[PDB]
Amino acid sequence: DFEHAISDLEAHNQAKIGVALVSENGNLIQGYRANERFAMCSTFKLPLAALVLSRIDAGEENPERKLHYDSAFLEEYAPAAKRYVATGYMTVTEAIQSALQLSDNAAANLLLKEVGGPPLLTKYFRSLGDKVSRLDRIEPTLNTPGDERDTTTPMSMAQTVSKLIFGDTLTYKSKGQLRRLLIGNQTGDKTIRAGLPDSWVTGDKTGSCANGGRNDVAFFITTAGKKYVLSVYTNAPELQGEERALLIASVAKLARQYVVH
Ligand SMILES: *C(=O)[C@H]([C@@H](C)O)[C@H]1C[C@@H](SCC/N=C\N)C(C(=O)O)=N1
Ligand SMILES: [Cl-]
Ligand SMILES: [Cl-]
């Protein structure tokens, strides 16, 4: 069974693995450590992008709005922001695309400023019925034992993402935009979607975090038209990076045994 298979993976890789596979409507299909906390150092950007789109939906923001910043605002991993910084700004749209598809840290910080900071994103999680996920600090500060700051659970994240991608909190327009952006993610070619058939439509947001953290949350649609979200959080400090991605792809190959192909 699923729980024994993931346990075997933990023991073989000296890793901690948390995973939830949920239906289109957020209902759990299989999981393993599904209600344990993991650091949410990058995957928070997915719900962050959705908050920004929902502000646009409500007329409180628009896509072409210029988010001003200078070199002091740069972070160590900010490939897009470093290219645009001489101009003085990134638009809302550029920052959303960069934070999602490149996991650009300065772009994510721009979007955090836009929405009112970590507390307003936490309020957004709560508003969507996610009682667990919380963001407290900005990049890269958000990345000790017992500290619940900047954490999610595999279940909370899968459920949240399922609501954003497949539910009705975003308009049809925004939901389409968010999905197309996630499909075009550039950082997830070796993670969850490497463990799924290539004919399935898949979009994802990855993360790489302290203590050997390598995470991915994806939506996918099988050739039968059946829609799912898979969250995978891993800590495998003895594995190399290519091996950590392969571990996530292995988890997805296990989880897909439980979906209608
Ligand atoms: C999440 O947003 C990560 C933050 C915490 O740095 C970010 C890092 C990239 S991994 C490649 C960059 N290497 C060193 N900093 C990442 C991602 O690709 O998902 N997320
Ligand atoms: Cl369902
Ligand atoms: Cl993450």
Side-chain angles (χ1 to χ4, degrees), residues 65-75 77-95:
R65 204 272 271 235
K66 301 186 183 169
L67 310 170
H68 287 94
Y69 75 98
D70 64 16
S71 293
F73 197 84
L74 288 176
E75 297 304 334
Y77 183 67
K82 287 169 187 189
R83 310 169 179 127
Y84 284 108
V85 63
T87 77
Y89 72 96
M90 291 176 68
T91 59
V92 171
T93 295
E94 290 163 350

PDB file of all heavy atoms in Angstrom, residues 65-95, unseen atoms left out:
ATOM      1  N   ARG A  65       0.462  47.568 -13.570  1.00  0.00           N
ATOM      2  CA  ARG A  65       0.941  48.383 -12.519  1.00  0.00           C
ATOM      3  C   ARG A  65       2.416  48.112 -12.240  1.00  0.00           C
ATOM      4  O   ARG A  65       2.835  46.949 -12.135  1.00  0.00           O
ATOM      5  CB  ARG A  65       0.127  48.145 -11.223  1.00  0.00           C
ATOM      6  CG  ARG A  65       0.159  49.328 -10.276  1.00  0.00           C
ATOM      7  CD  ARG A  65       1.305  49.352  -9.303  1.00  0.00           C
ATOM      8  NE  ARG A  65       0.975  48.642  -8.087  1.00  0.00           N
ATOM      9  CZ  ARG A  65       1.039  49.118  -6.855  1.00  0.00           C
ATOM     10  NH1 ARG A  65       1.513  50.329  -6.609  1.00  0.00           N
ATOM     11  NH2 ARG A  65       0.708  48.319  -5.845  1.00  0.00           N
ATOM     12  N   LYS A  66       3.185  49.193 -12.168  1.00  0.00           N
ATOM     13  CA  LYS A  66       4.643  49.159 -11.937  1.00  0.00           C
ATOM     14  C   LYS A  66       5.015  49.057 -10.454  1.00  0.00           C
ATOM     15  O   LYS A  66       4.536  49.837  -9.616  1.00  0.00           O
ATOM     16  CB  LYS A  66       5.256  50.405 -12.517  1.00  0.00           C
ATOM     17  CG  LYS A  66       4.989  50.534 -14.001  1.00  0.00           C
ATOM     18  CD  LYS A  66       5.746  51.713 -14.581  1.00  0.00           C
ATOM     19  CE  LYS A  66       5.367  51.841 -16.066  1.00  0.00           C
ATOM     20  NZ  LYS A  66       5.839  53.100 -16.665  1.00  0.00           N
ATOM     21  N   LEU A  67       5.773  48.021 -10.126  1.00  0.00           N
ATOM     22  CA  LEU A  67       6.232  47.767  -8.784  1.00  0.00           C
ATOM     23  C   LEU A  67       7.693  48.175  -8.749  1.00  0.00           C
ATOM     24  O   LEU A  67       8.608  47.482  -9.294  1.00  0.00           O
ATOM     25  CB  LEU A  67       6.011  46.316  -8.342  1.00  0.00           C
ATOM     26  CG  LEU A  67       4.634  45.718  -8.536  1.00  0.00           C
ATOM     27  CD1 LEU A  67       4.639  44.220  -8.274  1.00  0.00           C
ATOM     28  CD2 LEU A  67       3.632  46.411  -7.610  1.00  0.00           C
ATOM     29  N   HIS A  68       7.895  49.330  -8.127  1.00  0.00           N
ATOM     30  CA  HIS A  68       9.186  49.970  -8.110  1.00  0.00           C
ATOM     31  C   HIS A  68      10.109  49.383  -7.075  1.00  0.00           C
ATOM     32  O   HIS A  68       9.693  48.999  -5.986  1.00  0.00           O
ATOM     33  CB  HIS A  68       9.034  51.496  -7.902  1.00  0.00           C
ATOM     34  CG  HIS A  68       8.523  52.200  -9.095  1.00  0.00           C
ATOM     35  ND1 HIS A  68       7.185  52.464  -9.278  1.00  0.00           N
ATOM     36  CD2 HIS A  68       9.157  52.657 -10.202  1.00  0.00           C
ATOM     37  CE1 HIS A  68       7.020  53.094 -10.423  1.00  0.00           C
ATOM     38  NE2 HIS A  68       8.190  53.161 -11.027  1.00  0.00           N
ATOM     39  N   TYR A  69      11.386  49.308  -7.436  1.00  0.00           N
ATOM     40  CA  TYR A  69      12.412  48.760  -6.563  1.00  0.00           C
ATOM     41  C   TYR A  69      13.797  49.069  -7.119  1.00  0.00           C
ATOM     42  O   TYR A  69      13.948  49.392  -8.298  1.00  0.00           O
ATOM     43  CB  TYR A  69      12.231  47.248  -6.404  1.00  0.00           C
ATOM     44  CG  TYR A  69      12.655  46.450  -7.616  1.00  0.00           C
ATOM     45  CD1 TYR A  69      13.905  45.850  -7.675  1.00  0.00           C
ATOM     46  CD2 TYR A  69      11.803  46.295  -8.703  1.00  0.00           C
ATOM     47  CE1 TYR A  69      14.296  45.119  -8.781  1.00  0.00           C
ATOM     48  CE2 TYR A  69      12.184  45.566  -9.812  1.00  0.00           C
ATOM     49  CZ  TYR A  69      13.432  44.979  -9.846  1.00  0.00           C
ATOM     50  OH  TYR A  69      13.818  44.252 -10.949  1.00  0.00           O
ATOM     51  N   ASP A  70      14.805  48.969  -6.260  1.00  0.00           N
ATOM     52  CA  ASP A  70      16.148  49.252  -6.631  1.00  0.00           C
ATOM     53  C   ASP A  70      17.066  48.119  -6.216  1.00  0.00           C
ATOM     54  O   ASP A  70      16.626  47.116  -5.701  1.00  0.00           O
ATOM     55  CB  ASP A  70      16.624  50.596  -6.017  1.00  0.00           C
ATOM     56  CG  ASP A  70      16.670  50.566  -4.470  1.00  0.00           C
ATOM     57  OD1 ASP A  70      16.647  49.447  -3.848  1.00  0.00           O
ATOM     58  OD2 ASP A  70      16.752  51.683  -3.901  1.00  0.00           O
ATOM     59  N   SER A  71      18.362  48.252  -6.463  1.00  0.00           N
ATOM     60  CA  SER A  71      19.285  47.137  -6.221  1.00  0.00           C
ATOM     61  C   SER A  71      19.340  46.606  -4.798  1.00  0.00           C
ATOM     62  O   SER A  71      19.610  45.427  -4.588  1.00  0.00           O
ATOM     63  CB  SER A  71      20.722  47.495  -6.694  1.00  0.00           C
ATOM     64  OG  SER A  71      20.757  47.620  -8.104  1.00  0.00           O
ATOM     65  N   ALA A  72      19.074  47.465  -3.805  1.00  0.00           N
ATOM     66  CA  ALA A  72      19.070  47.041  -2.431  1.00  0.00           C
ATOM     67  C   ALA A  72      17.994  45.969  -2.202  1.00  0.00           C
ATOM     68  O   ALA A  72      18.096  45.183  -1.279  1.00  0.00           O
ATOM     69  CB  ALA A  72      18.816  48.221  -1.484  1.00  0.00           C
ATOM     70  N   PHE A  73      16.945  45.984  -3.026  1.00  0.00           N
ATOM     71  CA  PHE A  73      15.815  45.079  -2.884  1.00  0.00           C
ATOM     72  C   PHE A  73      16.101  43.712  -3.504  1.00  0.00           C
ATOM     73  O   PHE A  73      15.319  42.772  -3.326  1.00  0.00           O
ATOM     74  CB  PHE A  73      14.586  45.722  -3.536  1.00  0.00           C
ATOM     75  CG  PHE A  73      13.270  45.113  -3.117  1.00  0.00           C
ATOM     76  CD1 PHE A  73      12.652  45.530  -1.954  1.00  0.00           C
ATOM     77  CD2 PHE A  73      12.660  44.114  -3.892  1.00  0.00           C
ATOM     78  CE1 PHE A  73      11.447  44.967  -1.554  1.00  0.00           C
ATOM     79  CE2 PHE A  73      11.463  43.550  -3.504  1.00  0.00           C
ATOM     80  CZ  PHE A  73      10.849  43.986  -2.331  1.00  0.00           C
ATOM     81  N   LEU A  74      17.197  43.587  -4.237  1.00  0.00           N
ATOM     82  CA  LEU A  74      17.546  42.328  -4.846  1.00  0.00           C
ATOM     83  C   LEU A  74      17.826  41.256  -3.785  1.00  0.00           C
ATOM     84  O   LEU A  74      18.049  41.587  -2.626  1.00  0.00           O
ATOM     85  CB  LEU A  74      18.749  42.533  -5.768  1.00  0.00           C
ATOM     86  CG  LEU A  74      18.486  43.299  -7.066  1.00  0.00           C
ATOM     87  CD1 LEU A  74      19.804  43.487  -7.773  1.00  0.00           C
ATOM     88  CD2 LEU A  74      17.419  42.664  -7.987  1.00  0.00           C
ATOM     89  N   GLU A  75      17.662  39.985  -4.148  1.00  0.00           N
ATOM     90  CA  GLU A  75      18.063  38.858  -3.282  1.00  0.00           C
ATOM     91  C   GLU A  75      19.074  38.039  -4.047  1.00  0.00           C
ATOM     92  O   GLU A  75      19.228  38.256  -5.248  1.00  0.00           O
ATOM     93  CB  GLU A  75      16.849  37.975  -2.923  1.00  0.00           C
ATOM     94  CG  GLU A  75      15.769  38.697  -2.111  1.00  0.00           C
ATOM     95  CD  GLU A  75      16.287  39.315  -0.801  1.00  0.00           C
ATOM     96  OE1 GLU A  75      17.293  38.799  -0.280  1.00  0.00           O
ATOM     97  OE2 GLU A  75      15.682  40.303  -0.300  1.00  0.00           O
ATOM     98  N   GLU A  76      19.642  37.014  -3.405  1.00  0.00           N
ATOM     99  CA  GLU A  76      20.730  36.246  -4.005  1.00  0.00           C
ATOM    100  C   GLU A  76      20.252  35.448  -5.215  1.00  0.00           C
ATOM    101  O   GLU A  76      20.980  35.351  -6.185  1.00  0.00           O
ATOM    102  CB  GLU A  76      21.381  35.283  -2.997  1.00  0.00           C
ATOM    103  CG  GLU A  76      22.153  35.969  -1.873  1.00  0.00           C
ATOM    104  N   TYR A  77      19.046  34.864  -5.098  1.00  0.00           N
ATOM    105  CA  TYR A  77      18.381  34.146  -6.220  1.00  0.00           C
ATOM    106  C   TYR A  77      17.236  35.029  -6.683  1.00  0.00           C
ATOM    107  O   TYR A  77      16.145  35.001  -6.134  1.00  0.00           O
ATOM    108  CB  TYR A  77      17.861  32.779  -5.833  1.00  0.00           C
ATOM    109  CG  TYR A  77      17.283  32.084  -7.013  1.00  0.00           C
ATOM    110  CD1 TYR A  77      18.114  31.673  -8.072  1.00  0.00           C
ATOM    111  CD2 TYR A  77      15.916  31.920  -7.134  1.00  0.00           C
ATOM    112  CE1 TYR A  77      17.566  31.094  -9.212  1.00  0.00           C
ATOM    113  CE2 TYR A  77      15.373  31.312  -8.255  1.00  0.00           C
ATOM    114  CZ  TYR A  77      16.187  30.873  -9.267  1.00  0.00           C
ATOM    115  OH  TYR A  77      15.571  30.300 -10.400  1.00  0.00           O
ATOM    116  N   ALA A  78      17.510  35.824  -7.692  1.00  0.00           N
ATOM    117  CA  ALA A  78      16.516  36.692  -8.275  1.00  0.00           C
ATOM    118  C   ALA A  78      16.857  36.939  -9.741  1.00  0.00           C
ATOM    119  O   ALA A  78      17.217  38.030 -10.112  1.00  0.00           O
ATOM    120  CB  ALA A  78      16.479  37.991  -7.501  1.00  0.00           C
ATOM    121  N   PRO A  79      16.783  35.891 -10.563  1.00  0.00           N
ATOM    122  CA  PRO A  79      17.310  36.069 -11.962  1.00  0.00           C
ATOM    123  C   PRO A  79      16.604  37.125 -12.828  1.00  0.00           C
ATOM    124  O   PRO A  79      17.279  37.859 -13.572  1.00  0.00           O
ATOM    125  CB  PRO A  79      17.292  34.638 -12.563  1.00  0.00           C
ATOM    126  CG  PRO A  79      16.607  33.751 -11.589  1.00  0.00           C
ATOM    127  CD  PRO A  79      16.360  34.509 -10.263  1.00  0.00           C
ATOM    128  N   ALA A  80      15.296  37.211 -12.724  1.00  0.00           N
ATOM    129  CA  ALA A  80      14.512  38.179 -13.477  1.00  0.00           C
ATOM    130  C   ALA A  80      14.620  39.545 -12.874  1.00  0.00           C
ATOM    131  O   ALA A  80      14.860  40.530 -13.602  1.00  0.00           O
ATOM    132  CB  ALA A  80      13.083  37.789 -13.533  1.00  0.00           C
ATOM    133  N   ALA A  81      14.484  39.633 -11.549  1.00  0.00           N
ATOM    134  CA  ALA A  81      14.613  40.963 -10.925  1.00  0.00           C
ATOM    135  C   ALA A  81      15.966  41.651 -11.207  1.00  0.00           C
ATOM    136  O   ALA A  81      16.024  42.890 -11.389  1.00  0.00           O
ATOM    137  CB  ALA A  81      14.373  40.931  -9.416  1.00  0.00           C
ATOM    138  N   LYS A  82      17.047  40.877 -11.257  1.00  0.00           N
ATOM    139  CA  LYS A  82      18.398  41.427 -11.568  1.00  0.00           C
ATOM    140  C   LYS A  82      18.479  41.981 -12.980  1.00  0.00           C
ATOM    141  O   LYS A  82      19.156  42.987 -13.192  1.00  0.00           O
ATOM    142  CB  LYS A  82      19.513  40.367 -11.424  1.00  0.00           C
ATOM    143  CG  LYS A  82      19.841  40.005  -9.977  1.00  0.00           C
ATOM    144  CD  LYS A  82      20.753  38.787  -9.783  1.00  0.00           C
ATOM    145  CE  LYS A  82      20.853  38.448  -8.297  1.00  0.00           C
ATOM    146  NZ  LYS A  82      21.891  37.411  -8.019  1.00  0.00           N
ATOM    147  N   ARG A  83      17.792  41.342 -13.921  1.00  0.00           N
ATOM    148  CA  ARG A  83      17.699  41.897 -15.279  1.00  0.00           C
ATOM    149  C   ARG A  83      16.867  43.177 -15.418  1.00  0.00           C
ATOM    150  O   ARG A  83      17.209  44.088 -16.217  1.00  0.00           O
ATOM    151  CB  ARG A  83      17.193  40.834 -16.265  1.00  0.00           C
ATOM    152  CG  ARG A  83      17.949  39.548 -16.176  1.00  0.00           C
ATOM    153  CD  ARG A  83      17.287  38.389 -16.960  1.00  0.00           C
ATOM    154  NE  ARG A  83      18.104  37.185 -16.849  1.00  0.00           N
ATOM    155  CZ  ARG A  83      17.695  35.998 -16.450  1.00  0.00           C
ATOM    156  NH1 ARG A  83      16.422  35.778 -16.202  1.00  0.00           N
ATOM    157  NH2 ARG A  83      18.574  34.978 -16.424  1.00  0.00           N
ATOM    158  N   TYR A  84      15.782  43.281 -14.648  1.00  0.00           N
ATOM    159  CA  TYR A  84      14.919  44.435 -14.754  1.00  0.00           C
ATOM    160  C   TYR A  84      15.286  45.620 -13.830  1.00  0.00           C
ATOM    161  O   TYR A  84      14.766  46.696 -14.037  1.00  0.00           O
ATOM    162  CB  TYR A  84      13.481  44.049 -14.415  1.00  0.00           C
ATOM    163  CG  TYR A  84      12.808  43.290 -15.550  1.00  0.00           C
ATOM    164  CD1 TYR A  84      12.558  41.929 -15.440  1.00  0.00           C
ATOM    165  CD2 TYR A  84      12.436  43.931 -16.738  1.00  0.00           C
ATOM    166  CE1 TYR A  84      11.986  41.219 -16.473  1.00  0.00           C
ATOM    167  CE2 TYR A  84      11.817  43.208 -17.782  1.00  0.00           C
ATOM    168  CZ  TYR A  84      11.556  41.869 -17.612  1.00  0.00           C
ATOM    169  OH  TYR A  84      10.965  41.126 -18.632  1.00  0.00           O
ATOM    170  N   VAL A  85      16.204  45.419 -12.892  1.00  0.00           N
ATOM    171  CA  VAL A  85      16.377  46.410 -11.802  1.00  0.00           C
ATOM    172  C   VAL A  85      16.844  47.791 -12.325  1.00  0.00           C
ATOM    173  O   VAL A  85      16.488  48.829 -11.743  1.00  0.00           O
ATOM    174  CB  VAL A  85      17.354  45.934 -10.711  1.00  0.00           C
ATOM    175  CG1 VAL A  85      18.746  45.729 -11.219  1.00  0.00           C
ATOM    176  CG2 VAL A  85      17.312  46.920  -9.529  1.00  0.00           C
ATOM    177  N   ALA A  86      17.609  47.822 -13.418  1.00  0.00           N
ATOM    178  CA  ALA A  86      18.076  49.098 -13.972  1.00  0.00           C
ATOM    179  C   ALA A  86      16.934  49.961 -14.477  1.00  0.00           C
ATOM    180  O   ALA A  86      17.057  51.172 -14.583  1.00  0.00           O
ATOM    181  CB  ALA A  86      19.100  48.894 -15.047  1.00  0.00           C
ATOM    182  N   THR A  87      15.840  49.341 -14.849  1.00  0.00           N
ATOM    183  CA  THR A  87      14.674  50.060 -15.273  1.00  0.00           C
ATOM    184  C   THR A  87      13.924  50.663 -14.075  1.00  0.00           C
ATOM    185  O   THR A  87      13.063  51.484 -14.242  1.00  0.00           O
ATOM    186  CB  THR A  87      13.703  49.165 -16.077  1.00  0.00           C
ATOM    187  OG1 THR A  87      12.953  48.283 -15.202  1.00  0.00           O
ATOM    188  CG2 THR A  87      14.466  48.313 -17.122  1.00  0.00           C
ATOM    189  N   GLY A  88      14.202  50.189 -12.878  1.00  0.00           N
ATOM    190  CA  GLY A  88      13.444  50.640 -11.713  1.00  0.00           C
ATOM    191  C   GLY A  88      12.190  49.900 -11.307  1.00  0.00           C
ATOM    192  O   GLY A  88      11.639  50.222 -10.270  1.00  0.00           O
ATOM    193  N   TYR A  89      11.676  48.953 -12.105  1.00  0.00           N
ATOM    194  CA  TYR A  89      10.404  48.309 -11.755  1.00  0.00           C
ATOM    195  C   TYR A  89      10.224  47.019 -12.495  1.00  0.00           C
ATOM    196  O   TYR A  89      10.974  46.730 -13.464  1.00  0.00           O
ATOM    197  CB  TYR A  89       9.186  49.237 -12.065  1.00  0.00           C
ATOM    198  CG  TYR A  89       8.924  49.382 -13.580  1.00  0.00           C
ATOM    199  CD1 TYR A  89       7.981  48.583 -14.214  1.00  0.00           C
ATOM    200  CD2 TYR A  89       9.638  50.309 -14.357  1.00  0.00           C
ATOM    201  CE1 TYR A  89       7.740  48.685 -15.586  1.00  0.00           C
ATOM    202  CE2 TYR A  89       9.439  50.393 -15.729  1.00  0.00           C
ATOM    203  CZ  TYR A  89       8.474  49.581 -16.328  1.00  0.00           C
ATOM    204  OH  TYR A  89       8.218  49.686 -17.679  1.00  0.00           O
ATOM    205  N   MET A  90       9.309  46.205 -11.974  1.00  0.00           N
ATOM    206  CA  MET A  90       8.658  45.088 -12.698  1.00  0.00           C
ATOM    207  C   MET A  90       7.161  45.315 -12.600  1.00  0.00           C
ATOM    208  O   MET A  90       6.664  45.785 -11.567  1.00  0.00           O
ATOM    209  CB  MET A  90       9.082  43.712 -12.159  1.00  0.00           C
ATOM    210  CG  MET A  90      10.508  43.327 -12.430  1.00  0.00           C
ATOM    211  SD  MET A  90      11.085  41.769 -11.732  1.00  0.00           S
ATOM    212  CE  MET A  90      10.137  40.581 -12.694  1.00  0.00           C
ATOM    213  N   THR A  91       6.408  44.958 -13.647  1.00  0.00           N
ATOM    214  CA  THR A  91       4.985  45.092 -13.604  1.00  0.00           C
ATOM    215  C   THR A  91       4.499  43.952 -12.705  1.00  0.00           C
ATOM    216  O   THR A  91       5.225  42.952 -12.457  1.00  0.00           O
ATOM    217  CB  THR A  91       4.303  44.966 -14.984  1.00  0.00           C
ATOM    218  OG1 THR A  91       4.634  43.690 -15.510  1.00  0.00           O
ATOM    219  CG2 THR A  91       4.830  45.984 -15.930  1.00  0.00           C
ATOM    220  N   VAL A  92       3.273  44.093 -12.238  1.00  0.00           N
ATOM    221  CA  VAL A  92       2.572  42.995 -11.529  1.00  0.00           C
ATOM    222  C   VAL A  92       2.643  41.675 -12.299  1.00  0.00           C
ATOM    223  O   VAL A  92       3.045  40.688 -11.726  1.00  0.00           O
ATOM    224  CB  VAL A  92       1.116  43.363 -11.279  1.00  0.00           C
ATOM    225  CG1 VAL A  92       0.343  42.173 -10.751  1.00  0.00           C
ATOM    226  CG2 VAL A  92       1.055  44.517 -10.290  1.00  0.00           C
ATOM    227  N   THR A  93       2.324  41.705 -13.602  1.00  0.00           N
ATOM    228  CA  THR A  93       2.357  40.546 -14.450  1.00  0.00           C
ATOM    229  C   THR A  93       3.773  39.936 -14.511  1.00  0.00           C
ATOM    230  O   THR A  93       3.976  38.715 -14.322  1.00  0.00           O
ATOM    231  CB  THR A  93       1.839  40.892 -15.857  1.00  0.00           C
ATOM    232  OG1 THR A  93       0.435  41.250 -15.797  1.00  0.00           O
ATOM    233  CG2 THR A  93       2.040  39.715 -16.816  1.00  0.00           C
ATOM    234  N   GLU A  94       4.780  40.767 -14.763  1.00  0.00           N
ATOM    235  CA  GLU A  94       6.147  40.241 -14.825  1.00  0.00           C
ATOM    236  C   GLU A  94       6.549  39.608 -13.481  1.00  0.00           C
ATOM    237  O   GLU A  94       7.249  38.612 -13.420  1.00  0.00           O
ATOM    238  CB  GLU A  94       7.140  41.337 -15.180  1.00  0.00           C
ATOM    239  CG  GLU A  94       7.048  41.860 -16.624  1.00  0.00           C
ATOM    240  CD  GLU A  94       7.756  43.216 -16.841  1.00  0.00           C
ATOM    241  OE1 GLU A  94       8.167  43.876 -15.826  1.00  0.00           O
ATOM    242  OE2 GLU A  94       7.897  43.597 -18.042  1.00  0.00           O
ATOM    243  N   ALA A  95       6.154  40.226 -12.387  1.00  0.00           N
ATOM    244  CA  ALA A  95       6.583  39.726 -11.054  1.00  0.00           C
ATOM    245  C   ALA A  95       5.850  38.385 -10.789  1.00  0.00           C
ATOM    246  O   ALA A  95       6.430  37.418 -10.229  1.00  0.00           O
ATOM    247  CB  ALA A  95       6.231  40.773  -9.984  1.00  0.00           C
TER     248      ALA A  95
END
